[PDB]
Design an enzyme around this catalytic site. Structure first.
Site, short mmCIF file in Angstrom:
data_model
loop_
_atom_site.label_atom_id
_atom_site.label_comp_id
_atom_site.label_asym_id
_atom_site.label_seq_id
_atom_site.Cartn_x
_atom_site.Cartn_y
_atom_site.Cartn_z
N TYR E 26 39.48 -22.36 10.27
CA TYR E 26 38.97 -21.05 9.88
C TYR E 26 38.17 -20.40 11.01
O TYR E 26 37.53 -21.07 11.82
CB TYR E 26 38.09 -21.18 8.64
CG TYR E 26 36.69 -21.64 8.94
CD1 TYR E 26 36.44 -22.91 9.41
CD2 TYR E 26 35.61 -20.79 8.77
CE1 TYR E 26 35.17 -23.34 9.70
CE2 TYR E 26 34.33 -21.20 9.05
CZ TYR E 26 34.11 -22.48 9.51
OH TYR E 26 32.84 -22.91 9.80
N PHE E 36 31.13 -14.45 13.26
CA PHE E 36 29.88 -15.15 12.99
C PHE E 36 30.05 -16.67 12.94
O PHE E 36 29.10 -17.40 13.21
CB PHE E 36 29.26 -14.64 11.69
CG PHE E 36 30.11 -14.84 10.47
CD1 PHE E 36 31.07 -13.91 10.12
CD2 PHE E 36 29.95 -15.95 9.67
CE1 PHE E 36 31.85 -14.09 9.00
CE2 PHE E 36 30.73 -16.14 8.56
CZ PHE E 36 31.68 -15.20 8.22
N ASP E 37 31.25 -17.15 12.59
CA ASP E 37 31.52 -18.58 12.56
C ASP E 37 32.98 -18.82 12.85
O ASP E 37 33.84 -18.00 12.53
CB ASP E 37 31.14 -19.17 11.20
CG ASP E 37 31.22 -20.70 11.17
OD1 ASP E 37 31.46 -21.33 12.22
OD2 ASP E 37 31.04 -21.27 10.07
N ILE E 56 32.64 -22.35 -0.53
CA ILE E 56 32.49 -21.10 -1.27
C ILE E 56 33.74 -20.89 -2.12
O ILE E 56 34.83 -21.39 -1.80
CB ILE E 56 32.24 -19.92 -0.32
CG1 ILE E 56 31.17 -20.25 0.75
CG2 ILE E 56 31.82 -18.65 -1.10
CD1 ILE E 56 29.89 -20.89 0.22
N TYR E 82 28.72 -15.07 -0.85
CA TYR E 82 27.26 -15.13 -0.91
C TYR E 82 26.60 -13.86 -1.45
O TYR E 82 25.41 -13.89 -1.74
CB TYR E 82 26.67 -15.38 0.48
CG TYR E 82 27.14 -16.61 1.21
CD1 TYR E 82 26.48 -17.82 1.06
CD2 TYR E 82 28.21 -16.56 2.08
CE1 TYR E 82 26.90 -18.95 1.74
CE2 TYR E 82 28.64 -17.68 2.76
CZ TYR E 82 27.98 -18.87 2.59
OH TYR E 82 28.40 -19.99 3.27
N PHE E 99 38.45 -14.20 6.29
CA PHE E 99 38.78 -15.46 6.93
C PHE E 99 40.27 -15.50 7.22
O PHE E 99 41.06 -14.75 6.65
CB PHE E 99 38.40 -16.65 6.04
CG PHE E 99 36.93 -16.89 5.93
CD1 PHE E 99 36.28 -17.70 6.84
CD2 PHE E 99 36.20 -16.30 4.92
CE1 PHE E 99 34.93 -17.91 6.74
CE2 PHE E 99 34.85 -16.50 4.82
CZ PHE E 99 34.21 -17.31 5.73
#
Lengths: 758, 48, 290, 327, 107
Positions: E26, E36-37, E56, E82, E99
């Protein structure tokens, strides 16, 4: 824009480097949640490519290397450095193999000492336990529950190890070429942060034996195994800032040398004490076979057994170290081996008994002198570091002697429980620095609870006296107690936990109370508290220190005793405002506050069923003045005697209307006067020793009988009490506190004929 | 008002006084006993 | 000096001045002030002796008196025409002393200027001690209250050219110079000394509220920077709205490394972390990313 | 209780303690002179030379100036500074080597030669660089009886021994120049806290010594009886020794300054304060005589205690003499 | 809930089954924002087992609606993701997440 436009970047890089200062700031000392958050903004790949690059402006190169240290390596390095000043040595076969002798060359004490840090340490220290980063995990639905939040973000360390070995060699080789375009625009910018990284990774202790051998290579080819050519880094001329980091590296090597030295000492100790105790067994057995009883033989045989182990080991080794006046109870064979070991140890140090030292100890001495010749320094920190390094080498006996008090060996079996102890201690030391808050309070109690109820804390109090753990618990307690204001009682649970642990620590052994006695003046200074919170208090632990010593009681100063009774003066005046907020309407006195102070005053005197005269004398002189409060009843200005006050208290006890709606004022007054006469009766002059002739006893007994005269004890003891089979609580009246009155009569008055009949 | 305060105010600039004799001519002469003079609080600019 | 043991009285009455201590219990347990009301015969222990003061403090006291008089005249003038609409014409008779006040502000900031770091160590330390003493002498008698009152009175207006009418059209240009120099003068006082910023920590809400104007320029910003550096005890008092105000300043006045140093100093106390402000600034600043 | 059949790990802990007290703590150091010699001998390398008469400090001079810079910082209480203990003792033992390191009557040539090789050693150390270093930190130590004053004073005794008129000139000129009021205040504070003959503490300690009961073979952990009654023999002797050696030579200039400072605002007048300490000692020792007057034979511990007090009394008498020797 | 836009190559038949590991690669992306990730830059597969309810909801829901080999463009709503307060310090409140996943997972 690439991290590269130096003309345009003159304004921008100022801002950007200062933003990296913000990034390192919010990744403060002992924070990990923010660090995990910062891993998103700066990932692993960005960071690693910043490490490899050699086109940066230079301030950013320092900043990015420092950001790597701040995020991942800060927490572990701080914790492991705190535990680096301990030298626990478990007993193992691998431990016994270690020695001062270098492995592969006989007579190595004459030759070099091997190399520093290459040998196996087998020292007791914990792991790190990193955790990896992610941002696709569900948050904890429940509360914090004093959770650890995160351990720390993880990195593949093997990549960093193999990387960090590489560009150090490349930078040294490029410096050996002596170029004119250093990386980052200056030589110090090239060499400072890279050495900072490798210096921290030495503290991690995650370098192979070949790796530290390699790192020892390019410093200079002098510390070399027996088995341009990359000239030594020390030989090069280089500025002051880099020189400071060089001092840090050499300090690590000196610590490794010291740890190897003391570890080999413990390895010698195990074999030597085992064979020595076997010789003691055989000598006693030889006595048993052929005793042939005589006066002299009984003298030697008695002195072997009746003397404790302390004097036995002391005499056994004292006879060995002598200028031929040995009088040894043991043969010469063991003594020769011990002298060989001691000579080997002294030979390992600087004491021996062209410009090619071939050893670390001589090398760094010549090096720091050479730095001192040219380039008259200006950094104060460099001066302190340099001379700290210099003095440490030649006074190896001083360093060793200073280290051995905190060294302590343990069994193979109990190493597992020490991980729980040490890791909890690391939690405590890490949480010491942070400003206090609600989350760490719940977390801190877990460490205290596990270490208090571990098992290993019960055993080996010498180890607990080492490491400064009692000082550490005191250090956390003073911070919450500090502030000075009466409203500085924020988080009023750590005081209870700390005092509970300290109370249990004093009871383990006598010398622990000796260690705790030094702070005793400070603890009673803060003894003024709410006077009624549950659990332990500072005053309780202060009493617990001197409970059963019989020498610390003598050591009490007069300034300590006058302070507590000065607080007792206010108890009669003040009305205990905490219970005013509770609901109790109004009472002039404070029996509840007085009882605790009188309990501590009780514990001063009845040490081992006696009554010490000196403290008792000072107490009775002080007790005339400041207990003139508690109304005109006992002052004598009134006349309501003890029977009158107790009858009044019984009247309040049966009548809850007069008192307010655990604590009862009538029972409180009963308990207060019973404790007061417990103190007064206990501090009689001896029993009969000094009473039969010395004047001090007569003076003290006369003043003692005047305040509480006879024909009032007999009325009070003769009073009835409700005796149910329906039942009544003991929190209204007590029979043991009736027996407290009897203790006055036994010691003070005595009885001739008629008091017994009545 | 004027008070005989303790030693905390000794270093401060609160207790500053200027001795101003009467006549202008030779004001900074050697002072003598019984000489008339005047007191001047330099910080506030006032006179006792 | 040193040994006189002298007595003082009036020239006319000859009536000796001495304390009497007639006070009640309340002053007796509190302050030791003794009103030296004069009476017949005084007391036996009325002897006094003299101690001369060094050169610096007398000069500083005179500057304090002159600056206090000038700034009191300034405050009286500003309060004279504060609550008064006025049309096309002069405001009143006595105009303000603009030029004298400007020269005063310039000379005062020049006076408290710190020594050169290039100088040798010992004399630098001596000059530092002298500066700390001079700051203490100024702050004990006051001059933060006067400066605070002056800047607060000035900052009722916002335009700096037009809406500052009641002073006069002549004072249109001088307002920016006055407020900037006053901020720099406050910075000159607050620098270095621990006691000054320790006293001044009460005005955290006032200074952080004042950071909403171009006339309230970076002088007060670096005053706050010095306050956070020198007086770390105030760091616990900080709340979320102050951090939001600081971030609003960063957004409103563009990129500036000084604010970054301010936040960095705000983050960490004297060898102690603060998780609260750390989490607050981390939440507010980073994840927006704009 | 038998030494045998004990735990194997326990004996190691015993062994290191006895070995620490047996072989270690033996005078085998033999390196105090080498530090001062090595640091000061290499003023410059053979190849290294400015060649413009711009001489720079030596290594030793840099070391002294670091401590002097540290002392001048504004602070309330001085730090522990465990590093300073080492170099203080290392410096002091160097000049101690001549007088201490070295029956038969010595020759005149040998005695004069022994007076030499001490002014040179003192000149190697502190006639240049560290004259005012010792004097500064006494003023920094305002009232503490800690190890700062002890170690600094021991260095001060080492450099001033013999009289060292150069050193007296250096010390007096520095102290007169700076007008540093507070040094004599520090001496006054130190002098007031000196121990005397406390009979109550002696009686309590005699009862403690009489209580010879053992406690886990730890009776003698605090059964010393010497650290309780005086506790300050070395420090008191060294303090008054320093005051003696300041005016060993008949100056009549340092003595006048010590009696009464001129330029400073306040004068302490240490010479009267010494009389006050002597008067306190007189009352204490006189009371001890009354305690033992009824008793015929004197205890061994009592005579040992009284001899310690008498030695300190002797040193104050000699130090008192040197203020007035020479008219 | 989830609206993927798959990409052709891969098996496309072996769906995930309950209580088994699911390798991914991912790479996060914020809506009208930035990365961000990601795991490709970190070089780690990020193994996780479906069913334990640790990841999640949107990510596991999108993984449920696909099979081996096929790449996809996952989308997630704030309630699923979130976005009630947000993951602290990285994601803002009321976020909308994106994603895209590749895998060589065992089953």
């Amino acid at each position: 824009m690439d991290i590269l436009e130096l003309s345009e970047r003159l304004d921008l890089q100022r801002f950007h480097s200062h933003t990296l200062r913000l990034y390192r700031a919010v990744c403060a000392l002992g924070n990990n949640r923010v660090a995990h958050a910062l891993c998103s903004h700066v990932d692993q790949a960005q960071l690693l490519h910043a490490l490899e690059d050699a086109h940066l402006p230079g301030p950013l190169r320092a900043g990015y290397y420092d950001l790597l240290i701040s995020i991942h390596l800060e927490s572990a390095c701080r914790s492991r450095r705190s535990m680096l000043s301990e030298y626990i040595v478990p007993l193992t076969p691998e431990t016994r193999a270690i020695t001062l002798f270098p492995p592969g060359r006989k007579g190595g004490n004459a030759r070099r000492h091997g190399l520093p840090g290459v040998g196996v340490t087998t020292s007791l220290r914990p792991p790190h336990h990193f955790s990896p980063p992610c941002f696709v995990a569900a948050l904890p639905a429940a509360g914090v529950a004093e959770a650890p939040a995160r351990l720390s973000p993880a990195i593949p360390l093997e990549a960093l190890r193999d990387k960090a070995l590489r560009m150090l060699g490349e930078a040294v080789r490029d410096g050996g070429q002596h170029a004119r375009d250093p990386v980052g625009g200056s030589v110090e910018f090239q060499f400072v942060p890279v050495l900072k990284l490798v210096s921290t990774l030495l503290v991690m202790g995650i370098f192979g034996d070949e790796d530290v051998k390699q790192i020892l290579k390019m410093i200079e080819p002098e510390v070399f195994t027996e088995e341009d050519l990359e000239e030594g880094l020390l030989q090069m001329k280089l500025p002051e800032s880099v020189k400071l980091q060089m001092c840090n590296l050499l300090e690590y090597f000196c610590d490794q040398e010291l740890q190897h030295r003391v570890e080999s000492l413990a390895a010698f100790a195990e074999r030597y004490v085992d064979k020595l105790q076997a010789n003691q067994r055989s000598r006693y057995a030889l006595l048993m076979r052929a005793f042939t009883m005589s006066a002299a033989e009984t003298a030697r045989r008695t002195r072997e057994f009746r003397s404790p182990p302390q004097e036995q080991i002391n005499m056994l080794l004292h006879f060995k170290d002598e200028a031929d006046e040995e009088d040894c109870p043991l043969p010469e064979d063991i003594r020769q081996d011990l002298q060989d070991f001691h000579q080997d140890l002294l030979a390992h140090c600087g004491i021996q008994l062209e410009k090619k030292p071939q050893s670390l100890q001589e090398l760094v001495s010549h090096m720091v002198v050479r730095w001192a010749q040219e380039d008259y320094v200006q950094s104060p920190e460099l001066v302190r570091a340099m001379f700290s390094l210099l003095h440490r080498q030649y006074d190896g006996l001083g360093e060793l002697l200073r280290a051995l008090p905190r060294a302590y060996t343990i069994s193979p079996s109990s190493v597992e429980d020490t991980m729980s102890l040490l890791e909890c201690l690391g939690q405590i030391r890490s949480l010491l620095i942070v400003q206090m808050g609600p989350q760490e309070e719940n977390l801190m109690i877990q460490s205290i609870g596990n270490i208090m109820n571990n098992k290993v804390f019960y055993q080996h109090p010498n180890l607990m006296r080492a490491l400064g753990m009692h000082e550490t618990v005191m250090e956390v307690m003073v911070n919450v107690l500090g502030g000075g204001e009466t409203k500085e009682i924020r988080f009023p649970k750590m005081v209870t936990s700390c005092c509970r642990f300290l109370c249990y620590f004093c009871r383990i052994s006598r010398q622990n109370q000796r260690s705790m006695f030094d702070h005793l003046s400070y603890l009673l200074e803060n003894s003024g508290i709410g006077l009624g919170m549950q659990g332990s208090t500072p005053l309780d632990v202060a009493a617990a220190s001197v409970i059963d010593n019989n020498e610390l009681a003598l050591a009490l100063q007069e300034q300590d005793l006058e302070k507590v009774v000065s607080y007792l003066a206010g108890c009669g005046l003040q009305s205990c405002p905490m219970l005013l907020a509770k609901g109790y309407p109004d009472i002039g006195w404070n029996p509840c506050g007085g009882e605790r102070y009188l309990d501590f005053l009780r514990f001063a005197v009845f040490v081992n069923g006696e009554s010490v005269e000196e403290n008792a004398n000072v107490v009775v002189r002080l007790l005339i003045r400041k207990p003139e409060c508690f109304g005109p009843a006992l002052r004598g200005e009134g006349g309501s005697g003890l029977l009158a006050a107790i009858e009044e208290a019984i009247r309040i006890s049966e009548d809850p209307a007069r008192d307010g709606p655990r604590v009862h004022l009538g029972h409180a007054i009963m308990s207060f006067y019973a404790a007061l006469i417990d103190l007064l009766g206990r501090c009689a002059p001896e029993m009969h020793l000094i009473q039969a002739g010395k004047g001090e006893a007569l003076r003290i007994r006369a003043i003692l009988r005047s305040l509480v005269p006879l024909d009032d004890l007999v009325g009070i003891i003769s009073l009835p009490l409700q005796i149910p089979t329906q039942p009544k609580m003991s929190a209204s009246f007590v029979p043991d506190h009736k027996a407290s009155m009897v203790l006055f009569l036994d010691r003070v008055y005595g009885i001739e004929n008629q008091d017994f009949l009545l | 008002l004027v008070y005989y305060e303790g030693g905390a105010v000794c270093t401060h600039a609160r207790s500053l006084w200027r001795l101003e004799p009467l006549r202008i001519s030779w004001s900074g002469s050697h002072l003598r006993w019984g000489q008339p003079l005047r007191i001047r609080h330099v910080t506030t600019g006032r006179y006792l | 000096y040193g040994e006189s043991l002298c007595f003082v009285q009036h020239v006319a009455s000859g009536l000796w001045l001495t304390y009497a201590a007639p006070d009640p219990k309340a002053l007796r347990l509190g302050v030791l002030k003794k009103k030296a009301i004069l009476h017949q015969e005084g007391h036996m222990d009325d002897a006094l002796f003299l101690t001369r003061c060094q050169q610096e403090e007398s000069q500083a006291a005179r500057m304090i008196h002159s600056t206090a008089g000038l700034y009191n005249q300034f405050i009286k003038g500003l309060d004279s025409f504060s609550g008064k609409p006025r049309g096309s014409g002069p405001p009143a008779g006595p105009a303000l002393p603009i030029e004298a006040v400007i020269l005063s502000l310039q000379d005062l900031i020049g006076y408290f200027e710190p020594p050169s770091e290039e100088l040798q160590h010992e004399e630098k330390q001596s000059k530092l001690r002298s500066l700390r003493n001079r700051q203490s002498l100024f702050q004990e008698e006051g001059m933060l209250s006067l400066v605070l009152n002056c800047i607060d009175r000035l900052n009722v207006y916002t335009t700096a050219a037009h809406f500052a009418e009641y002073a006069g059209e002549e004072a249109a240009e001088s307002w920016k110079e006055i407020v900037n120099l006053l901020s720099e003068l406050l910075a000159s006082l607050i620098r270095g000394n621990r006691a000054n910023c320790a006293l001044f920590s009460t005005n955290l809400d006032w200074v952080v509220s004042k950071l909403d104007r171009l006339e309230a320029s970076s002088g007060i910003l670096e005053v706050l920077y010095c306050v956070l550096i020198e007086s770390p005890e105030v760091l616990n008092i900080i709340q979320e709205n102050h951090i939001k105000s600081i971030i609003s300043l960063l957004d409103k006045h563009g990129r500036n490394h000084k604010v970054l140093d301010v936040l960095c100093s705000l983050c960490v106390c004297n060898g102690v972390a603060v998780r609260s402000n750390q989490d607050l600034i981390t939440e507010n600043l980073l994840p927006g990313r704009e | 209780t038998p030494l045998y059949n004990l735990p194997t790990h326990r004996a190691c802990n015993m062994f290191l303690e006895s070995y620490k007290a047996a072989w270690i703590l033996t005078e085998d150091h033999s390196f105090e002179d080498r530090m001062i010699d090595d640091l000061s001998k290499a003023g410059e390398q053979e190849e290294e030379e400015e060649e413009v008469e711009e001489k720079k400090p030596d290594p030793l001079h840099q070391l002294v100036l670091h401590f002097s810079r540290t002392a001048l910082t504004e602070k309330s209480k001085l730090d522990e500074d465990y590093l300073y203990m080492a170099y203080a003792d290392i410096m002091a033992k160097s000049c101690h080597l001549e007088e201490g390191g070295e029956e038969v009557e010595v020759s005149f040539e040998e005695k004069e030669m022994e007076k030499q090789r001490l002014l040179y050693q003192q000149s190697r150390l502190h006639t240049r660089g560290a004259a005012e270093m010792v004097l500064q930190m006494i003023s920094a130590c305002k009232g503490e009886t800690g190890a700062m004053v002890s170690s600094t004073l021991k260095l001060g005794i080492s450099i001033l021994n013999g009289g060292n008129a150069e050193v007296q000139q250096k010390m007096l000129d520095y102290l007169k120049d700076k007008k540093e009021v507070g040094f004599f205040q520090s001496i006054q504070a130190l002098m007031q806290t000196c121990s005397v003959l406390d009979l109550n503490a002696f009686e309590r300690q005699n009862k403690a010594e009489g209580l010879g009961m053992v406690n886990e073979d730890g009776t003698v952990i605090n059964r010393q009886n010497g650290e309780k009654v005086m506790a300050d023999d070395e420090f008191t002797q060294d303090l008054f020794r320093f005051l003696q050696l300041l005016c060993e030579g008949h100056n009549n200039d340092f003595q006048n300054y010590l009696r009464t400072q001129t330029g400073n605002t306040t004068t302490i007048n240490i010479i009267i304060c010494t009389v006050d300490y002597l008067l306190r000692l007189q009352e204490s020792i006189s009371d001890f005589y009354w305690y033992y007057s009824g008793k015929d034979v004197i205890e061994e511990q009592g005579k040992r205690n009284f001899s310690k007090a008498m030695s300190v009394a002797k040193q104050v008498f000699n130090s008192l003499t040197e203020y007035i020797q020479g008219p | 809930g989830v609206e993927i836009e798959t990409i052709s190559p891969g098996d496309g038949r072996t769906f995930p089954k309950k209580g088994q590991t699911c390798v991914v690669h991912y790479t996060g992306m914020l809506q009208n924002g930035k990365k961000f990730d990601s795991s490709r830059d970190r070089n780690k597969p990020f193994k996780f087992r479906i069913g334990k309810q640790e990841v999640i909801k949107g990510f596991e829901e999108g993984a449920a609606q696909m099979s081996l080999g096929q790449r996809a463009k996952l989308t997630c709503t704030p309630d699923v993701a979130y976005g009630a307060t947000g993951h602290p310090g990285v994601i803002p409140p009321n976020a909308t997440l994106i994603f895209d996943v590749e895998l060589l997972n065992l089953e």
